[PDB]
Every structure is written in structure tokens, then in C-alpha cells.
Amino acid sequence: QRLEHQVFTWIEQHPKLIFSNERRQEIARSIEGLYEENRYEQVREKLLA
Amino acid sequence: QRLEHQVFTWIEQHPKLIFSNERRQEIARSIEGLYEENRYEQVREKLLA
């Protein structure tokens, strides 16, 4: 959870980026299911997307 | 050994992408020390990169 906070502080640090709400929910969900559903690679893969 | 062969075969099925000596050496480093120094994911990050 703290890492999630850091992730969305990394997001919230780039205001020039218009991360819609939907992509933010996607990221939230991808974090919520770490190592039970998807490893981190799918998370940072979408961030990089 | 077989997996590194397989990895490079899959790598090599698309010869078109430019591989630096550094990227290949990185792949060698990752494959050589799997589960003793780093997980296989570190390979997948760089390939998808």
C-alpha cells in the first residue's frame, strides 16, 4: 500500500501528463493484485505504456 | 543452458531489432545468475523495453 502511495505520487509528480481516471484505476487495480494476479512487470509495463 | 538457448532463439526470431553489445551482455548477466542474483523478470523488463 505504501508503495502504491509512492506510485501515485510518482504519477502526481508529472502534471504535464494527463493520466485519465480510468488509467489511474487500472494502475490501482494492478497494484492491488500484486503477485496474486500479476507480477510488477505488468504494472510498470502499463506505466511505460 | 537450454533456456538461454531458447531465449536467444526467441530473441533471434526477430533479428531486425538492433542489439547493442551492452544489451546482449546484460541478457548474459541476467541469465547466468538467475535465482542467485536476480529473478528472470529483470530479463523481461529489458526485452519488453
Distance from CA of A24 to the nearest CA of B (A): 21
Q: Could you tell me how far CA B9 lies from the centroid of its own chain?
A: 10
CA-to-CA dists, residue A6 to A16, A28, B36, B41, angstroms: 18, 12, 28, 21
Dig out the grid coordinates for B12 from the structure.
533471434
**Contact of B47 with B12, CB cutoff 8 Å:** no
**Contact of A8 with A26, CB cutoff 8 Å:** no
Q: What was the resolution (in A) of this experimentally determined structure?
A: 6.7
Site from A39, A41, A45, A47 to mutate, B interface, most B CB atoms within 10 angstroms: A41
